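Report of the visiting student (M.T.), summer placement. My assignment was to run the structure pipeline on a short list of targets and document each run. The first record concerns Cell division protein ftsY.
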Amino acid sequence: MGFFDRLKAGLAKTRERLLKAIPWGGNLEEVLEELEMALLAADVGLSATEEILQEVRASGRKDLKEAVKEKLVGMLEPDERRATLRKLGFNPQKPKPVEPKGRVVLVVGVNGVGKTTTIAKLGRYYQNLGKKVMFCAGDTFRAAGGTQLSEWGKRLSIPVIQGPEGTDPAALAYDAVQAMKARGYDLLFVDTAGRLHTKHNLMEELKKVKRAIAKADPEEPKEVWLVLDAVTGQNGLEQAKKFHEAVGLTGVIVTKLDGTAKGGVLIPIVRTLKVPIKFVGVGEGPDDLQPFDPEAFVEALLED
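After the run finished, the structure tokens were exported:
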């Protein structure tokens, strides 16, 4: 599958401007300067960059390069546990599969970041893992230009809970969870509206949908994942903060890394939202939505 080479390819635009050219053999002054410039130019942001230079300078008395990688990877792991295991030497070839904490995943994000396409790729990912998957077409206030989630469901043989344009999205989500439960489904992906400037406040609508999910199943949704487009950069972060404050994210999916030189944005994303990156979109293929691996990510940022 060339998992690792696919990621390197997806991060090529980001890496080939400055990162891979850093003169790791010169005197400190030069190499530190080039490193800071490369990090800033990749959208790592000043805060995170300044911290790296501090962690690698005074501290980090192993190989400079090795130090850098270690700090970048550390910034990308919100979970202390997995970070500990990593330090203990835990480094499997294939990144362990992402397992949703519960049966329902509420998918959120602004209109156009790729929520529909992402859910389709997730449906495939989880079907291949043997899960029985269901979709709920929550964005019922629009005819999502292009391929509707309903059409993707037919292509993948995944049932799609849906209603006429304008249907109460909370009521739809409740029906989907009941159907998921009644029909013995392992996972339900609830798509949601993404337009921030309509007659219906978006955050209020999402909170209503989440409430409805919980009403049908008191423990759900155990995952709330925000989809963010890498191309957008640090812009999709202020908004991300609002989604987090309204519905409580448990994870982030970053798409279209291959279309920007700003792939370092995943660092500020994790430091700001303090939730894990679940998958990364490295291309537009069905298997181009890869489960995130901090170590592999950082290696691809700086190598090849």
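Residues 77 and 83 are 6 Å apart (CA to CA). The beta strands are 104-108, 133-136, 160-161, 187-190, 223-229, 251-255, 277-281, 289-291. I thank the supervising group for their guidance throughout the placement.
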